Amino acid sequence: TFISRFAPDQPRKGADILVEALERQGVETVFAYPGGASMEIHQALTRSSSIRNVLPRHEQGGVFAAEGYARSSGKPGICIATSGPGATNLVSGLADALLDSVPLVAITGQVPRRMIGTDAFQETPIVEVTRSITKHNYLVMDVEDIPRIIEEAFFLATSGRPGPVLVDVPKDIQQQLAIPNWEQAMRLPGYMSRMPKPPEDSHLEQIVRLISESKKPVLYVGGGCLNSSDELGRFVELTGIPVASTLMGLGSYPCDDELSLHMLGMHGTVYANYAVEHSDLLLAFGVRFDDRVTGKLEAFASRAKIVHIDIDSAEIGKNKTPHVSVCGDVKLALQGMNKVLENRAEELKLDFGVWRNELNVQKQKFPLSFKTFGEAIPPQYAIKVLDELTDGKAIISTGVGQHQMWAAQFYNYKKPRQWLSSGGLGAMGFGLPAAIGASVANPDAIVVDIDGDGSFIMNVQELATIRVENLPVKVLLLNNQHLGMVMQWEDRFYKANRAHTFLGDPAQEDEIFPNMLLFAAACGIPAARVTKKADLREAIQTMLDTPGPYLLDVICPHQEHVLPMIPSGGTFNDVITEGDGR
Amino acid sequence: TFISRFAPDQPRKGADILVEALERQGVETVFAYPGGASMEIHQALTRSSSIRNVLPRHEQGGVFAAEGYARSSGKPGICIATSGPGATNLVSGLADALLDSVPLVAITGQVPRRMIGTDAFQETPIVEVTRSITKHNYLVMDVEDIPRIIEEAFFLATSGRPGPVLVDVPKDIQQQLAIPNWEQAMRLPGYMSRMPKPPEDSHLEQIVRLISESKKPVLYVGGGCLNSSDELGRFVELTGIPVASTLMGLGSYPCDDELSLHMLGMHGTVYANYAVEHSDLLLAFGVRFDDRVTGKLEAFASRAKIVHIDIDSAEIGKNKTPHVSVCGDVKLALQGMNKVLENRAEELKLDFGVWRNELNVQKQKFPLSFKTFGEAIPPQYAIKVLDELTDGKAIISTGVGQHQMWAAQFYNYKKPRQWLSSGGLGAMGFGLPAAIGASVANPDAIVVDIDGDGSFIMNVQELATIRVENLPVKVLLLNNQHLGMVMQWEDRFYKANRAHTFLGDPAQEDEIFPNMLLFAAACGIPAARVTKKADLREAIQTMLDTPGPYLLDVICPHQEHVLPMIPSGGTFNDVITEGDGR
Amino acid sequence: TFISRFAPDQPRKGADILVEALERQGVETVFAYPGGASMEIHQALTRSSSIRNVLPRHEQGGVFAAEGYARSSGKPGICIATSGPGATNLVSGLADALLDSVPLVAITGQVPRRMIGTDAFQETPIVEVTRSITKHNYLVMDVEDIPRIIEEAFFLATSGRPGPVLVDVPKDIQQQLAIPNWEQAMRLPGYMSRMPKPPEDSHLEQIVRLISESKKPVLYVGGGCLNSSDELGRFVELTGIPVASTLMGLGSYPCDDELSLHMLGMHGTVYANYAVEHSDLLLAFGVRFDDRVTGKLEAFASRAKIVHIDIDSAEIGKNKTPHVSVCGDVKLALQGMNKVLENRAEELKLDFGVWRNELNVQKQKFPLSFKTFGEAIPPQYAIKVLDELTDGKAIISTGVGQHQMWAAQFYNYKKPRQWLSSGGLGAMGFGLPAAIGASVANPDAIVVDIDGDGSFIMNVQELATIRVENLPVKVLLLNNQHLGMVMQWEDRFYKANRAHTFLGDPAQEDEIFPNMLLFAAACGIPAARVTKKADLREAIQTMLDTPGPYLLDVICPHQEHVLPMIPSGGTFNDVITEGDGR
Ligand SMILES: Cc1cc2nc3c(=O)[nH]c(=O)nc-3n(C[C@H](O)[C@H](O)[C@H](O)COP(=O)(O)OP(=O)(O)OC[C@H]3O[C@@H](n4cnc5c(N)ncnc54)[C@H](O)[C@@H]3O)c2cc1C
Ligand SMILES: Cc1cc2nc3c(=O)[nH]c(=O)nc-3n(C[C@H](O)[C@H](O)[C@H](O)COP(=O)(O)OP(=O)(O)OC[C@H]3O[C@@H](n4cnc5c(N)ncnc54)[C@H](O)[C@@H]3O)c2cc1C
Ligand SMILES: Cc1cc2nc3c(=O)[nH]c(=O)nc-3n(C[C@H](O)[C@H](O)[C@H](O)COP(=O)(O)OP(=O)(O)OC[C@H]3O[C@@H](n4cnc5c(N)ncnc54)[C@H](O)[C@@H]3O)c2cc1C
Ligand SMILES: CCOC(=O)c1ccccc1S(=O)(=O)NC(=O)Nc1nc(Cl)cc(OC)n1
Ligand SMILES: CCOC(=O)c1ccccc1S(=O)(=O)NC(=O)Nc1nc(Cl)cc(OC)n1
Ligand SMILES: CCOC(=O)c1ccccc1S(=O)(=O)NC(=O)Nc1nc(Cl)cc(OC)n1
Ligand SMILES: [Mg+2]
Ligand SMILES: [Mg+2]
Ligand SMILES: [Mg+2]
């Protein structure tokens, strides 16, 4: 089926064997920045007609773009870098992908084998450095291993709990001629042996039993449900259980649906954390009970039976001890529980209307809210407008901080993989590059990077990439001249004592600095600034209608605070519902 | 002598103990970007009146600035970052500092101790990740250890062979109240035990003997001589031996002096590599025989007695086996050899005029040269002009690539620490941030970042830093729209087959892209472009005269090639002396 | 040339491929104790007709026997063990072989691959455990790798600086059928690249020059000269330089020769340490300047030019900085220096008679001495008698402690590999097993284990091995009822306060306990006890004449002290020349 560009008996460079190894894996896009140790790989890349390369302006842009690509498509993201500084520049991306469980294959050039360990030119013990921040990694020591290693890398990166896999390739192996063997078996006996088997009916039916025996059930959905959109939907319309979601799970279940309790956790809705606090049955599907959503563990879902379904046994019971657990693919568990629920439909007759009502009053008394001052633009409102004008069908990437929380709170995602945000590591500068990858993976979609002025400037060089690759990336920059989140904490716990959180110029405290519009201009990207809430709707519409890339700089009053808020290690009873920096 | 801000019996936060620990070390400048896990440290920083913080726009800008600071002053550079993404963003800087042996202390915030290893919010096993790319590192586990650890970190970072030391501080330890003990002893028994002792006369006199017995002696000076400017000078005026230098040693001995053979190595002068090739005595002081300068080891200084003086025993004999070696401070070895040379002056009567003549003819027949096409600006010439207008007294930082080699070749450094360039790791994006640190460390100096368009855009966000800190950083951008060095190799070994090396826009192949002038404008930094060689001198003069920061975009024809050139693993007989991409 | 037992196209078990891999390496003897995880290997072993297995009674006996085998033959020693407890029981042997640089290949069975890391039955992460105590190690993950790994293991174990290499083989790979490829190349690019090249005449002639310019030269020979017996001899008869030896070098140069200064170091002769203390030229060939022989480094050979020739660059300059060094095979360096010395014979005319005389008076005034009390047997005398009756042609293995020092001091070894003793690690219980290996490697030699009662009982179970394998192992047990060496230190530095150093029975303080004769009897080995010095000569003669194994229990007064003695970190001026525990 796969047509090679070489004769089955024709020897060729390891670099060419590596590129074909990617083509055979179905790879169509890579993000690679050339360097001396990876030149061969780049040369082989130009001979490929099926793989396109998006040249970033910084290796970190490369990884983050690859992540965006992966996060928005469900396919693995592929980035390639040269040795030494090239490789070390990938680090934050690798750690980011590992914490959020993003399938990713990173390939780095390395000095020739004989040179390894000699403090060679541009050498870095990248395999040693990344071991604790990758799912697995490799140092290829023989051109004969390329086919197997690449196959194993993708298998490991995409199977079980997804994660990044780095493959280090010495320059001498890239140049070595050889005849590849695409028939070799993978050496993952231990891993393949531990791969979860399909869920058992005994386990699944025990859950359905618990559901029928509960009066206050709550679904706690996370990133693990990103491929169970339909199954989860069907499950909810069969149990009528309210859905609470993590920052990573947004979109698994439509935030606009009436059964949606939206996001729970530190900056989750009062009613979502309420539901969990008083539930008697917690259906934790595809979540890792992070400190961000649980607060004080002992207090989290204290009065309820916890059912935990995770593909990673290491997660089941790590922070919370379930009353029931299923180690396996939540997608299969749902399909299984669904058949059962459809059959015992009449026999069960599930009705949680009373519970839902208790929550609806909570949703009515404590809804997400924002204040509008004069004609100043409220970031929450800006996002709300973007949602409306895009009919909530846009792919949203973001930086980290207040804008991130607002992008999560005030936009209703219809489907998963519409939300691209760094959650576990929370790396700034992720938004723009992620949007680049998302756009390449989704050419006909509306891709909007809702960034912060601090996060946006970190990888601002990628604007050049966007222009050159002619990608329709829209940038909704919520400019507040500060490091919003750190500032909020300064206000709440440090008597507003500012400590290097102002991003503007102290000499002209009133001038917007820097002028992000000129950054766009430098890369030939049309831009505009908006300061009055009245002109907001038209500015955003313009951004959307103007073909190609576009940067809308939205000025906002910095004293805004993200609410509600449960301080770290807190309880639902410590939730802060009001206040700002005014 | 040191005045604390706390009573000797008054308990205070570990964060405050850490900041005072820095003040007691004489620290006056740090480069810190605030984050949740390091907020306490930042708060304590604002209470200090002796330490100023330069807030970068990216953690990588922070480290590189700290390096620039260190490299231009001889003091350790200090950068601080928050946990997780903050910390991982330091990686390239740490590896860079380790490879070039730059004293540096990096402090990173970390999640609370009890949270370590739990996959906590913004947690990264930074100590595990950086172990192979730092001189040493620490994870503080008790507020009581702060004083000792900080003292050890600086001692280790600055003593022996300088290098980076990272100190990870849990958030709970930053908030813990305690009374510091500044009297605690350091626990470096093994390290302090292995510290080289002052050179022995027996060893030193054996060297002077070799010098008197040689007919073709050559000095091979490197980064280890950065603090031996005077001693080396005196040594040369007592032996009249020609000085060849590494990229790291530039300036140890004035490149303008007649005894100077300039840089040796891959892109070294023909006469420098000549001198070494035919020498009978190689005085390797403060060098590590890198593959970049030796080429094929067996062929390097094949016909001569090698004397190697290094402060790191691990280096002596690593790639080349000396006939004589001295493990110790080259500064002391020189002072020692100098006294001997002054005494046995008449008894010795050293005369290498015949050898120097053989080299002068070589210097005359094969000098550094560049070609001028029409009115196009030759980068070499631009640098040559900068040298003249600044009287060669400027601090020059650079990116990595062709411009770096030209900045090395066509500028005559009078003193060491005038040249700030990433040599071992060769990390792009180093130039602008390094200039920032150099300027802060040298407020009254002319600081010029000779950057490449590829390297410059990587950390372009630091332009914001430059403006806000009101630093007189001048940027001489040699814009060639390409990744010059990779392109040169494509021309020489890949039939000019371009593989993602063009940095401009393919849709407007003739328009300079991006418009670096607008990047400067965005950060309120005056800029100008120059395209005609005739207008070059006035443009540079303007850049220098215009008070404050300034960006001069210098357009150059990309087909330029760095020469001469000895291909990797080559011999002096493989040196390429002509050709380009036209 | 090599005749397989399988058809070149016939598939067979990995176990059989491993055994053939050994046969192809020339292996004729292995020391293997069967276990569940290694059963396949043992089964394949019985099908071999060229490899004999010596079944020890304890895995530690296995390794030590393999060491003895290696140490007495110059061939690598091979031991095989099962997984878990089998493997961990090898540890002391591996560390011992690494510290003394003994070529050794250890093969351990391991649980099936899929079971690794699951806390399986008899599983131990042996590769992780032994990484810091082996030259290198492997975990075979594919039956296809066996041929290459075994070849690499032996190459690494025997090349450069010899050392142990452990190969872990999963049980499933032992049973997997396959067709071996004995043509595969080794993947040791880096290692083979760093292998020392033959010495250069420039370096060698510089040494001969130093020799001619010296008045007080001293040879400091170590374990690295074990294969340079002839070359060293020739070198000495051409320079007439006195030879001092380490505990590891004994026999490289005959201790009986008049030019021999015998052993230097802590328990070295007064004249040997004298020679070094006052020498002006130290020829350190095949030594690692251990703390045992140097004492206080600063004081060691303080007034002299040090020439160091080592095959391990990591050793040159580790503790002492030479004035000259040669990284390479001392055997070749000597052959080179010899040709030079033979030619410039007349031109040089070397005469160190005056120096030798200064030393001969020292050898006359401070010779090795022992005191004889009544009819009590002096251990020194016993060894002296053994030497005479065996004409100093016996292979002597020993335990660790006082008897070891006496075996070193009072026996004159004619050739290297006659002395088998644990020097760097100093592991007790080494003597008996080492003798077993030495005897198998030298069937027609006189093999005597000069053991201590403490060391002897540790691996006393090997007596069973000796009987069953019908090996002519003679055991000269110097029984003193104590842990001699620890006792000596108690006397000198702890006012003779005994702390668990008495090995006899406190209830019958005067009865020799245990009765080692009955241990021999239990294993059908003829034995006898001797208490009167007058009956000593006849007892030893009997031991030697009685065909087969024999144990002579020699009772000695425990208050004996090893002299002379330079306390740790001491100087030649701190040497203790008299005293005991009476
Ligand atoms: C400024 C900031 C504020 C934050 N505030 C909040 C907040 O208030 N609320 C909040 O929720 N988060 C918040 N976070 C995000 C937070 O750090 C965590 O990233 C997030 O809570 C993790 O959610 P998760 O466990 O659902 O998803 P993941 O971390 O993606 O974990 C998914 C889990 O699902 C398992 N799984 C994967 N695939 C499958 C499958 N097919 N079948 C079954 N199981 C599977 C995994 O192995 C894993 O255990 C914040 C982050 C930042 C940067
Ligand atoms: C694009 C590119 C091209 C390059 N081309 C060249 C080229 O053509 N020529 C070239 O020279 N380099 C070149 N390099 C730089 C090169 O990679 C190495 O960084 C450089 O050769 C190292 O020189 P060094 O050994 O002298 O200095 P360092 O790497 O700084 O090493 C200094 C050494 O001195 C020792 N030492 C330190 N302090 C003391 C003291 N007080 N007393 C005694 N010893 C001390 C150290 O421990 C160490 O061994 C290039 C780099 C790049 C990025
Ligand atoms: C109770 C006790 C007391 C001791 N007392 C003493 C004492 O008083 N005096 C004493 O000497 N020792 C003593 N030791 C032994 C001591 O611990 C060291 O094992 C010994 O000094 C090491 O000597 P070495 O360096 O010569 O040999 P090794 O440790 O075998 O080192 C040999 C060296 O030679 C190099 N080399 C190897 N092969 C070659 C080759 N072909 N060409 C060139 N170089 C090569 C190696 O790589 C290495 O650096 C004692 C030990 C014990 C247990
Ligand atoms: C930068 C990558 O370097 C290496 O892989 C490398 C490292 C040490 C020794 C030899 C090589 S090499 O000879 O296999 N390759 C190179 O040296 N390549 C190389 N490419 C570019 Cl573009 C520039 C350069 O040196 C300045 N060198
Ligand atoms: C980001 C640093 O985080 C931590 O140190 C951390 C990690 C896991 C659990 C508790 C904490 S903590 O309670 O000691 N501190 C915080 O959680 N700090 C914090 N600071 C900001 Cl500015 C934002 C935030 O959460 C969104 N959290
Ligand atoms: C002791 C070695 O054990 C193993 O290799 C082992 C470990 C875990 C699971 C399966 C095996 S196994 O099935 O490949 N082999 C055995 O279990 N062998 C085995 N051999 C013996 Cl003589 C006894 C025994 O179990 C009591 N088991
Ligand atoms: Mg902001
Ligand atoms: Mg360029
Ligand atoms: Mg004893």
3-state helix, strand, coil in chain B (%, to 5): 40, 15, 40
Among candidates A96, C136, C273, A21, which has minimal Cα distance to B89? A96
Q: Three-class SS of residue C5?
A: coil
Structure tokens at C256: 């009986």
How does DSSP classify residue A27? Answer: -
Query: Which H, E and C letters describe C8-59, residue by residue?
Result: CCCCEEHHHHHHHHHHCCCCCEEEECCCHHHHHHHHHHHHCCCCEECCCCCH
A142 contacts on C by Cβ (under 8 Å): 187
CA B524/CA B25 separation, integer angstroms: 36
CB A504 within 8 A of CB A512: yes
* Residues of B with catalytic roles: 59, 121-122, 171, 485
Sign of CA dihedral B217, B223, B227, B229: positive
Sign, CA torsion B192/B195/B197/B198: negative
**Dist. CA B209–CA C177, nearest whole Å:** 68
User: Which residues lie closer than 8 Å to C312 by C-beta, 6 or more apart?
Assistant: C160, C161, C327
What distance in Å separates the CA atoms of residue C78 and residue C75, rounded to the nearest whole number?
Answer: 9
3-state SS assignment for residue C555: strand
CB of C272 closer than 8 Å to CB of C263: yes
Phi/psi for B280 (5° steps) reads -115, -5
Using CB atoms, list chains with 3+ pairs below 8 Å to chain B.
A, C
Instruction: Of B37, B39, B58, B57, give the one whose Cα is nearest residue B124.
Output: B37
Residue nearest to atom 20 of ligand 4 (CA): A36
* Nearest CB neighbour to B203, from listed C197, C323, C327: C323
CA distance B219 to B236: 9
Six-digit token string for C512: 């020799």
Q: What is the DSSP string of C423-459?
A: -SS--TT-HHHHHHHHHHH-TTS-EEEEEEHHHHHHT
The 3-state DSSP class for residue B397 equals strand
Of B46, B57, B84, the CB nearest to A425: B84
Residue C151: CB atoms within 10 Å = 18
d(CA C286, CA C265): 15
- Picking from C121, C137, C171, the residue whose alpha carbon sits closest to that of residue C15 is C171
Residue B346 is inside which H or E element, if any? helix B345-348
Instruction: Report the residue of chain C nearest A195, measured CA to CA.
Output: C114
Pull the structure tokens for residue A529. Answer: 């600034």
Backbone angles phi, psi at B427, to 5 degrees: -85, 120
Q: Which amino acid is at C546?
A: T
Tell me the C-alpha distance between B16 and C573, whole Å: 52
Q: Chain A to chain C, count of Cβ pairs less than 8 Å apart?
A: 26
The number of the ligand 2 atom at minimal distance from the alpha carbon of B227 is 41
How far apart are alpha carbons B110 and B165 in whole angstroms? 16
Structure tokens at A8: 């089955």
Look at A189 and C113 and tell me if their CB atoms are within 8 Å: yes
* Residues A97/A163, Cβ–Cβ less than 8 Å: yes
Q: Which bin fits B524, alpha (ψ -120 to 50), beta or left (φ > 0)?
A: left
Give the distance between the most distant pair of CA atoms in chain B: 75
How far apart (Å, rounded) are the C-alpha atoms in residues C282 and C270? 17
3-state secondary structure of A218: strand
Question: Any idea how long chain A is?
Answer: 582
Neighbours of chain A (3+ CB pairs under 8 A): B, C
Closest atom of ligand 6 to CA, residue C120:
8
Q: How far apart are CA A137 and CA A152, in angstroms?
A: 10
Q: Output DSSP code: residue A108.
A: E
Give, rounded to a whole angstrom, the gap between the first and last alpha carbons of chain C. 66
For chain A, domain boundaries: 1-195, 196-368+563-582, 369-562
Nearest ligand to the CA atom of B478: 8
Q: What's the rounded Cα separation, in Å, for the pair C244 and C272?
A: 6
Distance between B541 CA and the closest CA of chain A, angstroms: 25
- The span from the CA of A277 to the CA of A303, in Å, is 8
Take atom 27 of ligand 3 and give the residue whose Cα is closest: C223
Taking the C-alpha atoms of residue B40 and residue A80, their distance in angstroms, rounded to an integer, is 38
CB-ligand 2 contact for B416 (6 Å cutoff): no
Name all residues whose Cβ lies below 6 A of ligand 4.
A 36-37, 83, 111-112, 115, 120-122, 171; B 266, 291, 485-486, 489, 568-569
Ligand 7 centroid – CA C533 distance (Å): 94
Among A34, A121, A458, the residue with its CB nearest the CB of B57 is A458
Q: How far is C509 from chain B (nearest CA, A)?
A: 45
Q: How many CB pairs under 8 A join A and B?
A: 243
Are B124 and A131 in contact, with CB atoms under 8 Å apart?
A: no
Compute and round to an integer the Cα radius of gyration of chain C.
25
Give strand pairing partners of A243: A219, A260
Question: Is B171 annotated as ligand-binding?
Answer: yes
DSSP state of A576: B
Output DSSP code: residue A564: S
Element (H, E) at C338: helix C330-343
Bridge-based pairing state of the strands A164-170 and A136-139: parallel
On whether the CB atoms of residues C293 and C265 are closer than 8 A, the answer is yes
Compare CB distances from A142 to C117, C118, C187 and report the shortest one's residue: C187
Cα–Cα nearest to B420, from B406, B439, B438, B402: B438
Selecting from A121, A505, A522 the residue whose C-beta is nearest the C-beta of B514 gives A522
The residues, ordered by sequence, that sit 6+ positions from C135 with a Cβ below 8 Å of its Cβ are C98, C156, C157, C161, C162, C163, C164, C165
Active site residues of C: 59, 121-122, 171, 485
Residue B558's Cβ-count burial label (10 Å; 0-12, 13-18, 19+) is: buried
B/e letters for B322-351, b = 16+ CB within 10 Å, e = fewer, are bbbbbbbbbbbbbbbbbebbeeeeeebebe
CA distance B101 to A551: 42
User: Which is it for strands A243-245 and A260-263: parallel, antiparallel or unpaired?
Assistant: parallel
Q: What is residue C523's three-state secondary structure? A: coil
- Whether A576 and A566 have beta carbons less than 8 Å apart is answered as yes
From the list C134, C327, B233, B293, the residue with the least C-alpha distance to B243 is B233
A113/C142 CB distance under 8 A: no
What's the one-letter identity of residue A134? T
Q: Which of B268, B317, B262 is nearest to B288 (CA)?
A: B317
Chain C residue with the nearest C-alpha to that of A118: C190
* Beta strands across the sheet bearing C527-530: C419-420, C395-398, C447-452, C473-479, C550-555, C527-530
User: Which burial class, exposed, middle or buried, applies to A580 when counting CB atoms under 10 A from its CB (0-12, 13-18, 19+)?
Assistant: middle
The CATH code of the domain at A1-195 is 3.40.50.970
Give A41 to chain C, closest Cα distance, Å: 22
CATH superfamily label, B369-562: Thiamin diphosphate (ThDP)-binding fold, Pyr/PP domains (3.40.50.970)
Q: What is the rounded end-to-end Cα distance, in angstroms, of chain A? A: 66
CA distance A149 to A391: 44
Query: Smallest Cα–Cα separation from A341: which of A180, A190, A231?
Result: A231
Question: Is residue B457 within 8 Å of B444, Cβ to Cβ?
Answer: no
Nearest CA among B231, B189, B190, B443 for reference residue B332: B231
- Are A189 and C114 inside 8 Å of each other by CB? yes
R_g (Cα) of chain B, nearest Å: 25
Length of chain C: 582
Contact B418, B390 (CB under 8 A): no
CA C224 to each of CA B147, C263, C287, C288, C294: distance values in angstroms, whole numbers, following the listed order: 47, 15, 6, 9, 17
Chain A residues within an 8 Å CB radius of B507: 468, 470
Cis peptide before B180 (omega within 30 of 0): no
Q: Give residue C577's identity as a one-letter amino acid code.
A: T
Torsion over CA of A467, A469, A471 and A475, rounded to 10 degrees? -40
Cα–Cα distance, A277 to A572 (Å, whole number): 7
Question: Helix/strand/coil (H, E, C) string of B435-493?
Answer: HHHHHHHCCCCCEEEEEEHHHHHHCCCHHHHHHHCCCCEEEEEEECCECHHHHHHHHHH
Resolution for this PDB entry, in angstroms: 2.5
Dist CA B390 CA B402 (whole Å):
22
Closest ligand by atom to A457 CA: 7
Q: Which two tokens stand for residue B119?
A: 């996959």
Pairing of the two strands C177-178 and C12-13: antiparallel
| DSSP 8-state class, residue A19 | H
Strands (E), B328-421: 395-398, 419-420
Chain B residues whose C-beta sits inside 8 Å of any chain C C-beta:
197, 202-203, 206, 298, 305, 313, 316-318, 321-327
Strand order in the sheet with B419-420: B419-420, B395-398, B447-452, B473-479, B550-555, B527-530
- Tell me which H or E stretch contains A451: strand A447-452
| Alpha-carbon distances, residue B379 vs B375, B536, C39 (angstroms) | 12, 11, 72
Query: What is the third-level CATH fold of C196-368+563-582?
Result: Rossmann fold (3.40.50)
Instruction: Find chains touching chain C: ≥3 CB pairs under 8 Å.
Output: A, B
Strand segments (E) across C86-210: 104-110, 136-139, 164-170, 177-178
Give per-residue burial for B229-251: e unless 16+ CB within 10 Å, then b: bebbbbbbebbebbbbbbbbbbb
Question: What letter would DSSP give residue B376?
Answer: B
DSSP state of B297: G
Q: What's the Cα-to-Cα distance from B449 to each of B72, B249, B386, B395, B478, rounded to whole Å?
A: 13, 18, 11, 8, 10
Verify whether ligand 3 is closer than 6 Å to residue C247 (CB atom). yes
d(CA A509, CA A488): 19
Residue the block writes with tokens 């946006």: A456
Contact indicator for A14, A43 with CB cutoff of 8 Å: no
Distances (CA, A) of C206 to B208, B326, C155, C201, C469: 16, 17, 32, 8, 53
- Measured CA to CA, the distance from residue B268 to residue B295 in angstroms comes to 12
CB-ligand 1 contact for A290 (6 Å cutoff): yes
Please tell me if the CB atom of residue C176 comes closer than 6 angstroms to any atom of ligand 6: no
Pairing of strands A12-13, A177-178: antiparallel
| Phi, psi dihedrals of residue C377, rounded to the nearest 5° | -80, 125
Cis preceding-peptide flag for C526 (omega within 30 of 0): no
Strand ranges of the sheet holding B281-285, from the earlier edge strand across to the other edge: B260-263, B243-245, B217-221, B281-285, B305-310, B324-327
d(Cα C4, Cα C44) in Å, to the nearest integer? Answer: 13
Distance in angstroms (rounded) separating the CA atoms of residues C430 and B21: 53
Does ligand 6 come within 6 angstroms of the Cβ of C116?
no
**What is the dihedral angle through the alpha carbons of A511, A515, A516, A518, rounded to the nearest 10 degrees?**
160
C136 known ligand binder? no
Query: What whole-number distance in Å separates Cα of residue A493 and Cα of residue A470?
Result: 45
C377 C-alpha vs ligand 9 centroid, how far in Å? 14
Decide: A465 and A55 in contact? Cβ < 8 Å: yes
Q: Is the Cα torsion angle B226, B227, B229, B235 positive or negative in sign?
A: negative
Contact C316, C197 (CB under 8 A): no
Residues 6+ apart with CB under 8 A from C288: C222, C310, C315, C318, C319
A106 bridge partner residues: A79, A166
Query: A291, B425: Cβ pair inside 8 Å?
Result: no
What does the DSSP 8-state code read for residue C222?
Answer: -
The answer to whether C519 and C529 have CB atoms below 8 angstroms apart is: no
